[PDB]
Amino acid sequence: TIDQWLLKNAKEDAIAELKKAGITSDFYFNAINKAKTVEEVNALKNEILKAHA
């Protein structure tokens, strides 16, 4: 199974820690659900610190 894959797991979990970080860009929250796996979602949020800040 694992169909849950979609990667929609760390989606809100991470973004939930971003909206408060002060970053509200959609190129980080939107491309978040586009990532591949959880490592790609949490990795994107870690790139904003250098891919935008």
From Swiss-Prot:
Q: Where is this region: GA module?
A: 1-53
Localization recorded for this chain is: Secreted, Cell wall
Role according to the record: Binds serum albumin.
Q: What is this protein called?
A: Peptostreptococcal albumin-binding protein
What organism is listed for this UniProt entry?
A: Finegoldia magna (Peptostreptococcus magnus)
Query: Which lineage is the organism of this entry classified under, starting from the top rank?
Result: Bacteria, Bacillati, Bacillota, Tissierellia, Tissierellales
